[PDB]
Amino acid sequence: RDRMVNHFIAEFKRKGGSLVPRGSGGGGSRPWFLEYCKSECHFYNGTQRVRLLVRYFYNLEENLRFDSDVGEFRAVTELGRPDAENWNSQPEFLEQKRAEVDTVCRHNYEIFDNFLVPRRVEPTVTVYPTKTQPLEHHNLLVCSVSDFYPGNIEVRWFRNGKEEKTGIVSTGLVRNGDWTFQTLVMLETVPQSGEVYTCQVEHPSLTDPVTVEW
């Protein structure tokens, strides 16, 4: 158990003027209005160096943002300017956001470094063909690598010895939403006698690679 997670505090936007609108699509479209915001704490190496980036949207487009590196708000589109200018004129606000790299970004990292960061789950490696009966093209050797976390991993198919670096139909890293990844690395080949196929999976939960021959 760690401390309590901090959050970025919302500021009221001084109304501003009114901008002559660009447009809006219709033809099977119903009217909607969305005020959406994203405060991205970007850690390059833990809390050593961090980059904050707050991105304010509205309907289909980002219209204002606050980059750690720039140090002030910037209009991304005209709609955001009235705000960029106002918030930028509030010196006290500009320091708030500036301190947020710490009071929020780091404060929360530190906490999360206790459970989230080190979360690891070994992948259940699985090999098998899609053997039909005919086809001719030849049923691809499916090396399903499932339920692992973090995402980063390396799955290699080997043709008896060397890294068969081709015909590797893959899904890429698939994300299930319940903090578990998976990926099928399928090898297009013609299974014949006297040759065993291998799947070599290296992962941050694996000290040594997992290899499944077939």
Binding site: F8, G46, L79, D178
Partner: protein, 182 residues
């Protein structure tokens, strides 16, 4: 070594629907989200609850301001309601599908906006309400949303499943069919 990570605090408020949202993301996965109504923190994985604590009022307060801002913003642009971007659907299993061994079908609605959808799971033609769960509206790198839907299913040789997505930007609800194949 070197730890590269990103935590995001994404929040929104959407009219006419009068429904907001306040959540945190860790390298792409929901750490947790607040229930603006019930006013409670809902960790993505319950085990989290034993490591950190978010005072759920915090969210309620930010949404209060995001509620204000939207009325400001909606005025600053003549109440011009942008278009609706129809979502892309895709049904896949949560892990290898063996006959008889319990699994889950993931219904991934991706790249859409506004953040509102009607998703329905159909087992053998009928709507399934038991053994179904969904995630809140998850952020993307861009301005669009993705949201996951799950259905616990028993890999049978006899069945078939569909996911029905209905969004204010689709002419007719979309329906991707999944079905065991061997």
């Amino acid at each position: 070594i070197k730890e590269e990570h990103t935590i995001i605090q994404a929040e929104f408020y959407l009219l006419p629907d009068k429904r907001g949202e306040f959540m945190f993301d860790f390298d792409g996965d929901e750490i947790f989200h607040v229930d603006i109504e019930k006013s409670e923190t809902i960790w993505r994985l319950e085990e989290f609850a034993k490591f950190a604590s978010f005072e759920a009022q915090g969210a309620l307060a930010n949404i209060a301001v995001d509620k204000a801002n939207l009325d400001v913003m909606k005025e600053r642009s003549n109440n011009t309601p942008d278009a609706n971007v129809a979502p892309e659907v895709t049904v896949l299993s949560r892990s290898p599908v063996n006959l008889g061994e319990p699994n889950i079908l993931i219904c991934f609605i991706d790249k859409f906006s506004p953040p509102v959808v009607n998703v329905t799971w159909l087992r053998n033609g009928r709507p399934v309400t038991e053994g179904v769960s969904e995630t809140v509206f998850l952020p993307r790198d861009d301005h669009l949303f993705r949201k996951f839907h799950y259905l616990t299913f028993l890999p049978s040789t006899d069945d078939f499943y569909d996911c029905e997505v209905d969004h204010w930007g689709l002419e007719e609800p979309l329906r991707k069919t999944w079905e065991f194949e061997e």
